[PDB]
Structures are given as C-alpha cells and as structure tokens.
C-alpha cells in the first residue's frame, strides 16, 4: 500500500495537470474565434464607412 | 478609415485647385494678347534694362 499510495499520488497529480491543460487549449481556441470575429466586424465597417 | 478619407479630401482639393489654376493662367494669357501694345512693351523694357 505504500507504493500504491505513491503511484496514486503521482497519477492524481498528472490527471489534475491534464485537466488544467484542456481548459488552456479550449481558451486558446476561443481567443482565435473571437479575434477573427472582431477583425471581420471592423473590416466590414471600414469598407462601408469609407465608401459612403 | 478616417485618416484615409482625410487624405482623399486633401488630394481631391489639390487636384481641383490645379485644374482651376490652369484655367486662370490660360485666361491671363489671352488677356495679355488682348491688351499688350508697344507702349506697354517699352514700359516693360525700361523696367528690365535697368539691370
């Protein structure tokens, strides 16, 4: 049980770190999405304002 | 966008200014043709030949 507790502690550490990792990667995806949306919004506004 | 519009305004205003300047100077040339004579020619010469 001492060695099993060692293994359990290491496994729990790595599982927690991977569960943080999924949050980080999802946040990166969201940042790319919102930046693309804002760029499109501002660019179309540029086109129509300068034309008028 | 506003910077580009301001630059376009400046450019177009200069373009039209140059067009009307062309017109004005051509009119001045024709006026000279319609007004110059020997007395004016001698007046101009006497202002020139001082130097």
PDB file of N, CA and C in Angstrom:
ATOM      1  N   UNK A   1       0.809  -1.211   0.000  1.00  0.00           N
ATOM      2  CA  UNK A   1       0.000   0.000   0.000  1.00  0.00           C
ATOM      3  C   UNK A   1       0.846   1.266   0.000  1.00  0.00           C
ATOM      4  N   UNK A   2       2.071   1.235   0.540  1.00  0.00           N
ATOM      5  CA  UNK A   2       2.898   2.438   0.469  1.00  0.00           C
ATOM      6  C   UNK A   2       3.220   2.791  -0.982  1.00  0.00           C
ATOM      7  N   UNK A   3       3.642   1.796  -1.765  1.00  0.00           N
ATOM      8  CA  UNK A   3       3.942   2.039  -3.172  1.00  0.00           C
ATOM      9  C   UNK A   3       2.680   2.342  -3.970  1.00  0.00           C
ATOM     10  N   UNK A   4       1.558   1.704  -3.626  1.00  0.00           N
ATOM     11  CA  UNK A   4       0.305   2.039  -4.297  1.00  0.00           C
ATOM     12  C   UNK A   4      -0.099   3.484  -4.023  1.00  0.00           C
ATOM     13  N   UNK A   5       0.147   3.974  -2.805  1.00  0.00           N
ATOM     14  CA  UNK A   5      -0.127   5.374  -2.493  1.00  0.00           C
ATOM     15  C   UNK A   5       0.795   6.307  -3.269  1.00  0.00           C
ATOM     16  N   UNK A   6       2.075   5.942  -3.393  1.00  0.00           N
ATOM     17  CA  UNK A   6       2.989   6.692  -4.255  1.00  0.00           C
ATOM     18  C   UNK A   6       2.435   6.816  -5.674  1.00  0.00           C
ATOM     19  N   UNK A   7       2.042   5.680  -6.255  1.00  0.00           N
ATOM     20  CA  UNK A   7       1.515   5.682  -7.616  1.00  0.00           C
ATOM     21  C   UNK A   7       0.235   6.502  -7.712  1.00  0.00           C
ATOM     22  N   UNK A   8      -0.642   6.388  -6.711  1.00  0.00           N
ATOM     23  CA  UNK A   8      -1.888   7.145  -6.714  1.00  0.00           C
ATOM     24  C   UNK A   8      -1.622   8.643  -6.671  1.00  0.00           C
ATOM     25  N   UNK A   9      -0.667   9.073  -5.843  1.00  0.00           N
ATOM     26  CA  UNK A   9      -0.341  10.494  -5.761  1.00  0.00           C
ATOM     27  C   UNK A   9       0.192  11.012  -7.093  1.00  0.00           C
ATOM     28  N   UNK A  10       1.118  10.268  -7.709  1.00  0.00           N
ATOM     29  CA  UNK A  10       1.657  10.708  -8.996  1.00  0.00           C
ATOM     30  C   UNK A  10       0.569  10.760 -10.067  1.00  0.00           C
ATOM     31  N   UNK A  11      -0.286   9.735 -10.110  1.00  0.00           N
ATOM     32  CA  UNK A  11      -1.360   9.697 -11.097  1.00  0.00           C
ATOM     33  C   UNK A  11      -2.339  10.843 -10.895  1.00  0.00           C
ATOM     34  N   UNK A  12      -2.667  11.159  -9.639  1.00  0.00           N
ATOM     35  CA  UNK A  12      -3.595  12.251  -9.370  1.00  0.00           C
ATOM     36  C   UNK A  12      -2.992  13.592  -9.774  1.00  0.00           C
ATOM     37  N   UNK A  13      -1.696  13.787  -9.506  1.00  0.00           N
ATOM     38  CA  UNK A  13      -1.022  15.000  -9.966  1.00  0.00           C
ATOM     39  C   UNK A  13      -1.132  15.148 -11.479  1.00  0.00           C
ATOM     40  N   UNK A  14      -0.787  14.090 -12.218  1.00  0.00           N
ATOM     41  CA  UNK A  14      -0.796  14.200 -13.675  1.00  0.00           C
ATOM     42  C   UNK A  14      -2.211  14.369 -14.220  1.00  0.00           C
ATOM     43  N   UNK A  15      -3.195  13.708 -13.606  1.00  0.00           N
ATOM     44  CA  UNK A  15      -4.578  13.867 -14.047  1.00  0.00           C
ATOM     45  C   UNK A  15      -5.057  15.298 -13.847  1.00  0.00           C
ATOM     46  N   UNK A  16      -4.747  15.889 -12.690  1.00  0.00           N
ATOM     47  CA  UNK A  16      -5.121  17.279 -12.453  1.00  0.00           C
ATOM     48  C   UNK A  16      -4.453  18.208 -13.459  1.00  0.00           C
ATOM     49  N   UNK A  17      -3.175  17.962 -13.760  1.00  0.00           N
ATOM     50  CA  UNK A  17      -2.480  18.827 -14.709  1.00  0.00           C
ATOM     51  C   UNK A  17      -3.082  18.719 -16.110  1.00  0.00           C
ATOM     52  N   UNK A  18      -3.443  17.506 -16.539  1.00  0.00           N
ATOM     53  CA  UNK A  18      -4.090  17.357 -17.842  1.00  0.00           C
ATOM     54  C   UNK A  18      -5.465  18.023 -17.869  1.00  0.00           C
ATOM     55  N   UNK A  19      -6.193  17.975 -16.749  1.00  0.00           N
ATOM     56  CA  UNK A  19      -7.494  18.634 -16.705  1.00  0.00           C
ATOM     57  C   UNK A  19      -7.351  20.154 -16.733  1.00  0.00           C
ATOM     58  N   UNK A  20      -6.238  20.684 -16.224  1.00  0.00           N
ATOM     59  CA  UNK A  20      -5.934  22.098 -16.451  1.00  0.00           C
ATOM     60  C   UNK A  20      -5.581  22.355 -17.917  1.00  0.00           C
ATOM     61  N   UNK A  21      -4.884  21.400 -18.535  1.00  0.00           N
ATOM     62  CA  UNK A  21      -4.448  21.550 -19.919  1.00  0.00           C
ATOM     63  C   UNK A  21      -5.631  21.695 -20.869  1.00  0.00           C
ATOM     64  N   UNK A  22      -6.696  20.920 -20.642  1.00  0.00           N
ATOM     65  CA  UNK A  22      -7.846  21.007 -21.546  1.00  0.00           C
ATOM     66  C   UNK A  22      -8.473  22.397 -21.475  1.00  0.00           C
ATOM     67  N   UNK A  23      -8.529  22.985 -20.274  1.00  0.00           N
ATOM     68  CA  UNK A  23      -9.029  24.351 -20.126  1.00  0.00           C
ATOM     69  C   UNK A  23      -8.166  25.318 -20.925  1.00  0.00           C
ATOM     70  N   UNK A  24      -6.843  25.171 -20.817  1.00  0.00           N
ATOM     71  CA  UNK A  24      -5.938  26.089 -21.512  1.00  0.00           C
ATOM     72  C   UNK A  24      -6.158  26.023 -23.023  1.00  0.00           C
ATOM     73  N   UNK A  25      -6.247  24.806 -23.564  1.00  0.00           N
ATOM     74  CA  UNK A  25      -6.379  24.656 -25.013  1.00  0.00           C
ATOM     75  C   UNK A  25      -7.737  25.158 -25.506  1.00  0.00           C
ATOM     76  N   UNK A  26      -8.800  24.911 -24.732  1.00  0.00           N
ATOM     77  CA  UNK A  26     -10.106  25.463 -25.080  1.00  0.00           C
ATOM     78  C   UNK A  26     -10.066  26.988 -25.105  1.00  0.00           C
ATOM     79  N   UNK A  27      -9.370  27.591 -24.136  1.00  0.00           N
ATOM     80  CA  UNK A  27      -9.253  29.046 -24.101  1.00  0.00           C
ATOM     81  C   UNK A  27      -8.512  29.574 -25.326  1.00  0.00           C
ATOM     82  N   UNK A  28      -7.467  28.866 -25.764  1.00  0.00           N
ATOM     83  CA  UNK A  28      -6.767  29.278 -26.982  1.00  0.00           C
ATOM     84  C   UNK A  28      -7.705  29.267 -28.188  1.00  0.00           C
ATOM     85  N   UNK A  29      -8.499  28.200 -28.322  1.00  0.00           N
ATOM     86  CA  UNK A  29      -9.457  28.126 -29.426  1.00  0.00           C
ATOM     87  C   UNK A  29     -10.435  29.299 -29.380  1.00  0.00           C
ATOM     88  N   UNK A  30     -10.956  29.599 -28.186  1.00  0.00           N
ATOM     89  CA  UNK A  30     -11.894  30.710 -28.038  1.00  0.00           C
ATOM     90  C   UNK A  30     -11.257  32.046 -28.408  1.00  0.00           C
ATOM     91  N   UNK A  31      -9.999  32.263 -28.010  1.00  0.00           N
ATOM     92  CA  UNK A  31      -9.333  33.513 -28.361  1.00  0.00           C
ATOM     93  C   UNK A  31      -9.239  33.671 -29.870  1.00  0.00           C
ATOM     94  N   UNK A  32      -8.830  32.605 -30.568  1.00  0.00           N
ATOM     95  CA  UNK A  32      -8.748  32.693 -32.024  1.00  0.00           C
ATOM     96  C   UNK A  32     -10.108  33.031 -32.627  1.00  0.00           C
ATOM     97  N   UNK A  33     -11.165  32.374 -32.136  1.00  0.00           N
ATOM     98  CA  UNK A  33     -12.510  32.626 -32.650  1.00  0.00           C
ATOM     99  C   UNK A  33     -12.913  34.091 -32.487  1.00  0.00           C
ATOM    100  N   UNK A  34     -12.773  34.625 -31.271  1.00  0.00           N
ATOM    101  CA  UNK A  34     -13.262  35.978 -31.012  1.00  0.00           C
ATOM    102  C   UNK A  34     -12.425  37.012 -31.761  1.00  0.00           C
ATOM    103  N   UNK A  35     -11.114  36.777 -31.886  1.00  0.00           N
ATOM    104  CA  UNK A  35     -10.286  37.708 -32.648  1.00  0.00           C
ATOM    105  C   UNK A  35     -10.698  37.731 -34.113  1.00  0.00           C
ATOM    106  N   UNK A  36     -10.985  36.557 -34.687  1.00  0.00           N
ATOM    107  CA  UNK A  36     -11.455  36.517 -36.070  1.00  0.00           C
ATOM    108  C   UNK A  36     -12.765  37.285 -36.231  1.00  0.00           C
ATOM    109  N   UNK A  37     -13.702  37.089 -35.298  1.00  0.00           N
ATOM    110  CA  UNK A  37     -14.992  37.771 -35.390  1.00  0.00           C
ATOM    111  C   UNK A  37     -14.824  39.287 -35.328  1.00  0.00           C
ATOM    112  N   UNK A  38     -14.006  39.766 -34.388  1.00  0.00           N
ATOM    113  CA  UNK A  38     -13.793  41.205 -34.261  1.00  0.00           C
ATOM    114  C   UNK A  38     -13.128  41.779 -35.505  1.00  0.00           C
ATOM    115  N   UNK A  39     -12.153  41.056 -36.063  1.00  0.00           N
ATOM    116  CA  UNK A  39     -11.496  41.519 -37.280  1.00  0.00           C
ATOM    117  C   UNK A  39     -12.499  41.667 -38.415  1.00  0.00           C
ATOM    118  N   UNK A  40     -13.373  40.670 -38.588  1.00  0.00           N
ATOM    119  CA  UNK A  40     -14.378  40.755 -39.646  1.00  0.00           C
ATOM    120  C   UNK A  40     -15.307  41.947 -39.437  1.00  0.00           C
ATOM    121  N   UNK A  41     -15.768  42.144 -38.197  1.00  0.00           N
ATOM    122  CA  UNK A  41     -16.670  43.253 -37.896  1.00  0.00           C
ATOM    123  C   UNK A  41     -16.036  44.592 -38.267  1.00  0.00           C
ATOM    124  N   UNK A  42     -14.825  44.837 -37.759  1.00  0.00           N
ATOM    125  CA  UNK A  42     -14.157  46.113 -38.000  1.00  0.00           C
ATOM    126  C   UNK A  42     -13.855  46.314 -39.481  1.00  0.00           C
ATOM    127  N   UNK A  43     -13.448  45.248 -40.176  1.00  0.00           N
ATOM    128  CA  UNK A  43     -13.094  45.366 -41.586  1.00  0.00           C
ATOM    129  C   UNK A  43     -14.304  45.729 -42.445  1.00  0.00           C
ATOM    130  N   UNK A  44     -15.447  45.072 -42.212  1.00  0.00           N
ATOM    131  CA  UNK A  44     -16.638  45.417 -42.985  1.00  0.00           C
ATOM    132  C   UNK A  44     -17.070  46.852 -42.696  1.00  0.00           C
ATOM    133  N   UNK A  45     -16.966  47.274 -41.428  1.00  0.00           N
ATOM    134  CA  UNK A  45     -17.273  48.666 -41.111  1.00  0.00           C
ATOM    135  C   UNK A  45     -16.360  49.623 -41.871  1.00  0.00           C
ATOM    136  N   UNK A  46     -15.060  49.307 -41.946  1.00  0.00           N
ATOM    137  CA  UNK A  46     -14.138  50.125 -42.729  1.00  0.00           C
ATOM    138  C   UNK A  46     -14.639  50.289 -44.154  1.00  0.00           C
ATOM    139  N   UNK A  47     -14.952  49.161 -44.801  1.00  0.00           N
ATOM    140  CA  UNK A  47     -15.379  49.210 -46.197  1.00  0.00           C
ATOM    141  C   UNK A  47     -16.562  50.152 -46.376  1.00  0.00           C
ATOM    142  N   UNK A  48     -17.626  49.949 -45.588  1.00  0.00           N
ATOM    143  CA  UNK A  48     -18.842  50.713 -45.858  1.00  0.00           C
ATOM    144  C   UNK A  48     -18.672  52.186 -45.484  1.00  0.00           C
ATOM    145  N   UNK A  49     -17.958  52.477 -44.389  1.00  0.00           N
ATOM    146  CA  UNK A  49     -17.798  53.868 -43.979  1.00  0.00           C
ATOM    147  C   UNK A  49     -16.989  54.652 -45.013  1.00  0.00           C
ATOM    148  N   UNK A  50     -15.887  54.071 -45.512  1.00  0.00           N
ATOM    149  CA  UNK A  50     -15.068  54.808 -46.473  1.00  0.00           C
ATOM    150  C   UNK A  50     -15.804  54.972 -47.795  1.00  0.00           C
ATOM    151  N   UNK A  51     -16.571  53.958 -48.211  1.00  0.00           N
ATOM    152  CA  UNK A  51     -17.349  54.101 -49.441  1.00  0.00           C
ATOM    153  C   UNK A  51     -18.334  55.267 -49.341  1.00  0.00           C
ATOM    154  N   UNK A  52     -19.110  55.309 -48.251  1.00  0.00           N
ATOM    155  CA  UNK A  52     -20.125  56.355 -48.124  1.00  0.00           C
ATOM    156  C   UNK A  52     -19.486  57.739 -48.062  1.00  0.00           C
TER     157      UNK A  52
ATOM    158  N   UNK B   1      -9.535  54.409 -41.223  1.00  0.00           N
ATOM    159  CA  UNK B   1     -10.551  54.796 -42.201  1.00  0.00           C
ATOM    160  C   UNK B   1     -10.690  56.317 -42.288  1.00  0.00           C
ATOM    161  N   UNK B   2     -10.799  56.991 -41.136  1.00  0.00           N
ATOM    162  CA  UNK B   2     -10.922  58.450 -41.181  1.00  0.00           C
ATOM    163  C   UNK B   2      -9.661  59.110 -41.724  1.00  0.00           C
ATOM    164  N   UNK B   3      -8.488  58.554 -41.408  1.00  0.00           N
ATOM    165  CA  UNK B   3      -7.256  59.080 -41.991  1.00  0.00           C
ATOM    166  C   UNK B   3      -7.268  58.967 -43.512  1.00  0.00           C
ATOM    167  N   UNK B   4      -7.708  57.818 -44.036  1.00  0.00           N
ATOM    168  CA  UNK B   4      -7.774  57.642 -45.485  1.00  0.00           C
ATOM    169  C   UNK B   4      -8.742  58.639 -46.117  1.00  0.00           C
ATOM    170  N   UNK B   5      -9.893  58.865 -45.478  1.00  0.00           N
ATOM    171  CA  UNK B   5     -10.852  59.820 -46.031  1.00  0.00           C
ATOM    172  C   UNK B   5     -10.269  61.229 -46.029  1.00  0.00           C
ATOM    173  N   UNK B   6      -9.576  61.608 -44.952  1.00  0.00           N
ATOM    174  CA  UNK B   6      -8.974  62.937 -44.904  1.00  0.00           C
ATOM    175  C   UNK B   6      -7.921  63.106 -45.991  1.00  0.00           C
ATOM    176  N   UNK B   7      -7.095  62.078 -46.200  1.00  0.00           N
ATOM    177  CA  UNK B   7      -6.100  62.146 -47.264  1.00  0.00           C
ATOM    178  C   UNK B   7      -6.765  62.276 -48.630  1.00  0.00           C
ATOM    179  N   UNK B   8      -7.871  61.556 -48.845  1.00  0.00           N
ATOM    180  CA  UNK B   8      -8.589  61.670 -50.114  1.00  0.00           C
ATOM    181  C   UNK B   8      -9.140  63.080 -50.305  1.00  0.00           C
ATOM    182  N   UNK B   9      -9.697  63.665 -49.242  1.00  0.00           N
ATOM    183  CA  UNK B   9     -10.176  65.042 -49.312  1.00  0.00           C
ATOM    184  C   UNK B   9      -9.053  65.996 -49.707  1.00  0.00           C
ATOM    185  N   UNK B  10      -7.903  65.874 -49.048  1.00  0.00           N
ATOM    186  CA  UNK B  10      -6.769  66.741 -49.352  1.00  0.00           C
ATOM    187  C   UNK B  10      -6.330  66.590 -50.810  1.00  0.00           C
ATOM    188  N   UNK B  11      -6.205  65.341 -51.267  1.00  0.00           N
ATOM    189  CA  UNK B  11      -5.791  65.062 -52.639  1.00  0.00           C
ATOM    190  C   UNK B  11      -6.751  65.669 -53.655  1.00  0.00           C
ATOM    191  N   UNK B  12      -8.052  65.438 -53.470  1.00  0.00           N
ATOM    192  CA  UNK B  12      -9.039  65.939 -54.422  1.00  0.00           C
ATOM    193  C   UNK B  12      -9.081  67.462 -54.422  1.00  0.00           C
ATOM    194  N   UNK B  13      -8.962  68.074 -53.242  1.00  0.00           N
ATOM    195  CA  UNK B  13      -8.954  69.528 -53.190  1.00  0.00           C
ATOM    196  C   UNK B  13      -7.753  70.096 -53.942  1.00  0.00           C
ATOM    197  N   UNK B  14      -6.579  69.471 -53.794  1.00  0.00           N
ATOM    198  CA  UNK B  14      -5.416  69.913 -54.567  1.00  0.00           C
ATOM    199  C   UNK B  14      -5.618  69.696 -56.070  1.00  0.00           C
ATOM    200  N   UNK B  15      -6.217  68.563 -56.452  1.00  0.00           N
ATOM    201  CA  UNK B  15      -6.451  68.273 -57.867  1.00  0.00           C
ATOM    202  C   UNK B  15      -7.331  69.342 -58.510  1.00  0.00           C
ATOM    203  N   UNK B  16      -8.454  69.656 -57.864  1.00  0.00           N
ATOM    204  CA  UNK B  16      -9.353  70.671 -58.406  1.00  0.00           C
ATOM    205  C   UNK B  16      -8.717  72.060 -58.383  1.00  0.00           C
ATOM    206  N   UNK B  17      -7.928  72.353 -57.344  1.00  0.00           N
ATOM    207  CA  UNK B  17      -7.211  73.619 -57.301  1.00  0.00           C
ATOM    208  C   UNK B  17      -6.288  73.764 -58.504  1.00  0.00           C
ATOM    209  N   UNK B  18      -5.576  72.693 -58.858  1.00  0.00           N
ATOM    210  CA  UNK B  18      -4.683  72.758 -60.012  1.00  0.00           C
ATOM    211  C   UNK B  18      -5.458  72.902 -61.325  1.00  0.00           C
ATOM    212  N   UNK B  19      -6.605  72.226 -61.458  1.00  0.00           N
ATOM    213  CA  UNK B  19      -7.410  72.413 -62.667  1.00  0.00           C
ATOM    214  C   UNK B  19      -7.810  73.881 -62.850  1.00  0.00           C
ATOM    215  N   UNK B  20      -8.361  74.492 -61.792  1.00  0.00           N
ATOM    216  CA  UNK B  20      -8.816  75.880 -61.896  1.00  0.00           C
ATOM    217  C   UNK B  20      -7.640  76.828 -62.058  1.00  0.00           C
ATOM    218  N   UNK B  21      -6.480  76.474 -61.507  1.00  0.00           N
ATOM    219  CA  UNK B  21      -5.289  77.271 -61.748  1.00  0.00           C
ATOM    220  C   UNK B  21      -4.907  77.257 -63.222  1.00  0.00           C
ATOM    221  N   UNK B  22      -4.985  76.082 -63.856  1.00  0.00           N
ATOM    222  CA  UNK B  22      -4.756  76.002 -65.300  1.00  0.00           C
ATOM    223  C   UNK B  22      -5.688  76.959 -66.031  1.00  0.00           C
ATOM    224  N   UNK B  23      -6.982  76.911 -65.691  1.00  0.00           N
ATOM    225  CA  UNK B  23      -7.945  77.781 -66.364  1.00  0.00           C
ATOM    226  C   UNK B  23      -7.592  79.252 -66.180  1.00  0.00           C
ATOM    227  N   UNK B  24      -7.271  79.647 -64.943  1.00  0.00           N
ATOM    228  CA  UNK B  24      -6.984  81.048 -64.649  1.00  0.00           C
ATOM    229  C   UNK B  24      -5.785  81.547 -65.448  1.00  0.00           C
ATOM    230  N   UNK B  25      -4.700  80.763 -65.481  1.00  0.00           N
ATOM    231  CA  UNK B  25      -3.499  81.258 -66.153  1.00  0.00           C
ATOM    232  C   UNK B  25      -3.718  81.322 -67.667  1.00  0.00           C
ATOM    233  N   UNK B  26      -4.486  80.379 -68.228  1.00  0.00           N
ATOM    234  CA  UNK B  26      -4.788  80.467 -69.655  1.00  0.00           C
ATOM    235  C   UNK B  26      -5.590  81.729 -69.969  1.00  0.00           C
ATOM    236  N   UNK B  27      -6.579  82.036 -69.132  1.00  0.00           N
ATOM    237  CA  UNK B  27      -7.314  83.279 -69.306  1.00  0.00           C
ATOM    238  C   UNK B  27      -6.413  84.498 -69.230  1.00  0.00           C
ATOM    239  N   UNK B  28      -5.444  84.478 -68.311  1.00  0.00           N
ATOM    240  CA  UNK B  28      -4.490  85.585 -68.217  1.00  0.00           C
ATOM    241  C   UNK B  28      -3.670  85.733 -69.499  1.00  0.00           C
ATOM    242  N   UNK B  29      -3.254  84.611 -70.093  1.00  0.00           N
ATOM    243  CA  UNK B  29      -2.518  84.678 -71.357  1.00  0.00           C
ATOM    244  C   UNK B  29      -3.346  85.361 -72.445  1.00  0.00           C
ATOM    245  N   UNK B  30      -4.604  84.937 -72.596  1.00  0.00           N
ATOM    246  CA  UNK B  30      -5.457  85.577 -73.598  1.00  0.00           C
ATOM    247  C   UNK B  30      -5.669  87.057 -73.294  1.00  0.00           C
ATOM    248  N   UNK B  31      -5.774  87.416 -72.015  1.00  0.00           N
ATOM    249  CA  UNK B  31      -5.918  88.824 -71.654  1.00  0.00           C
ATOM    250  C   UNK B  31      -4.694  89.621 -72.086  1.00  0.00           C
ATOM    251  N   UNK B  32      -3.497  89.074 -71.854  1.00  0.00           N
ATOM    252  CA  UNK B  32      -2.277  89.740 -72.316  1.00  0.00           C
ATOM    253  C   UNK B  32      -2.344  89.966 -73.817  1.00  0.00           C
ATOM    254  N   UNK B  33      -2.754  88.935 -74.559  1.00  0.00           N
ATOM    255  CA  UNK B  33      -2.860  89.094 -76.009  1.00  0.00           C
ATOM    256  C   UNK B  33      -3.848  90.201 -76.373  1.00  0.00           C
ATOM    257  N   UNK B  34      -4.940  90.321 -75.620  1.00  0.00           N
ATOM    258  CA  UNK B  34      -5.965  91.327 -75.889  1.00  0.00           C
ATOM    259  C   UNK B  34      -5.625  92.721 -75.366  1.00  0.00           C
ATOM    260  N   UNK B  35      -4.483  92.909 -74.698  1.00  0.00           N
ATOM    261  CA  UNK B  35      -4.180  94.179 -74.050  1.00  0.00           C
ATOM    262  C   UNK B  35      -2.777  94.734 -74.305  1.00  0.00           C
ATOM    263  N   UNK B  36      -1.800  93.911 -74.702  1.00  0.00           N
ATOM    264  CA  UNK B  36      -0.421  94.384 -74.798  1.00  0.00           C
ATOM    265  C   UNK B  36      -0.237  95.229 -76.058  1.00  0.00           C
ATOM    266  N   UNK B  37       0.683  96.189 -75.987  1.00  0.00           N
ATOM    267  CA  UNK B  37       0.977  97.057 -77.122  1.00  0.00           C
ATOM    268  C   UNK B  37       2.396  97.598 -76.983  1.00  0.00           C
ATOM    269  N   UNK B  38       2.779  98.469 -77.926  1.00  0.00           N
ATOM    270  CA  UNK B  38       4.152  98.967 -77.964  1.00  0.00           C
ATOM    271  C   UNK B  38       4.484  99.818 -76.744  1.00  0.00           C
ATOM    272  N   UNK B  39       3.537 100.633 -76.277  1.00  0.00           N
ATOM    273  CA  UNK B  39       3.815 101.454 -75.102  1.00  0.00           C
ATOM    274  C   UNK B  39       4.073 100.584 -73.879  1.00  0.00           C
ATOM    275  N   UNK B  40       3.253  99.546 -73.694  1.00  0.00           N
ATOM    276  CA  UNK B  40       3.488  98.603 -72.607  1.00  0.00           C
ATOM    277  C   UNK B  40       4.800  97.857 -72.808  1.00  0.00           C
ATOM    278  N   UNK B  41       5.128  97.520 -74.060  1.00  0.00           N
ATOM    279  CA  UNK B  41       6.389  96.836 -74.334  1.00  0.00           C
ATOM    280  C   UNK B  41       7.575  97.706 -73.922  1.00  0.00           C
ATOM    281  N   UNK B  42       7.524  99.002 -74.241  1.00  0.00           N
ATOM    282  CA  UNK B  42       8.610  99.901 -73.864  1.00  0.00           C
ATOM    283  C   UNK B  42       8.665 100.126 -72.356  1.00  0.00           C
ATOM    284  N   UNK B  43       7.508 100.201 -71.690  1.00  0.00           N
ATOM    285  CA  UNK B  43       7.492 100.294 -70.232  1.00  0.00           C
ATOM    286  C   UNK B  43       8.180  99.085 -69.607  1.00  0.00           C
ATOM    287  N   UNK B  44       7.849  97.893 -70.097  1.00  0.00           N
ATOM    288  CA  UNK B  44       8.464  96.671 -69.580  1.00  0.00           C
ATOM    289  C   UNK B  44       9.962  96.685 -69.845  1.00  0.00           C
ATOM    290  N   UNK B  45      10.361  97.109 -71.049  1.00  0.00           N
ATOM    291  CA  UNK B  45      11.784  97.156 -71.386  1.00  0.00           C
ATOM    292  C   UNK B  45      12.525  98.097 -70.442  1.00  0.00           C
ATOM    293  N   UNK B  46      11.951  99.276 -70.180  1.00  0.00           N
ATOM    294  CA  UNK B  46      12.612 100.236 -69.306  1.00  0.00           C
ATOM    295  C   UNK B  46      12.650  99.767 -67.859  1.00  0.00           C
ATOM    296  N   UNK B  47      11.698  98.934 -67.440  1.00  0.00           N
ATOM    297  CA  UNK B  47      11.865  98.312 -66.131  1.00  0.00           C
ATOM    298  C   UNK B  47      12.931  97.216 -66.160  1.00  0.00           C
ATOM    299  N   UNK B  48      13.141  96.570 -67.314  1.00  0.00           N
ATOM    300  CA  UNK B  48      14.116  95.483 -67.397  1.00  0.00           C
ATOM    301  C   UNK B  48      15.553  95.992 -67.517  1.00  0.00           C
ATOM    302  N   UNK B  49      15.805  96.924 -68.440  1.00  0.00           N
ATOM    303  CA  UNK B  49      17.165  97.276 -68.853  1.00  0.00           C
ATOM    304  C   UNK B  49      17.912  98.058 -67.780  1.00  0.00           C
ATOM    305  N   UNK B  50      17.248  98.329 -66.655  1.00  0.00           N
ATOM    306  CA  UNK B  50      17.955  98.892 -65.515  1.00  0.00           C
ATOM    307  C   UNK B  50      18.990  97.924 -64.959  1.00  0.00           C
ATOM    308  N   UNK B  51      18.826  96.628 -65.214  1.00  0.00           N
ATOM    309  CA  UNK B  51      19.757  95.605 -64.757  1.00  0.00           C
ATOM    310  C   UNK B  51      20.045  94.611 -65.878  1.00  0.00           C
TER     311      UNK B  51
END
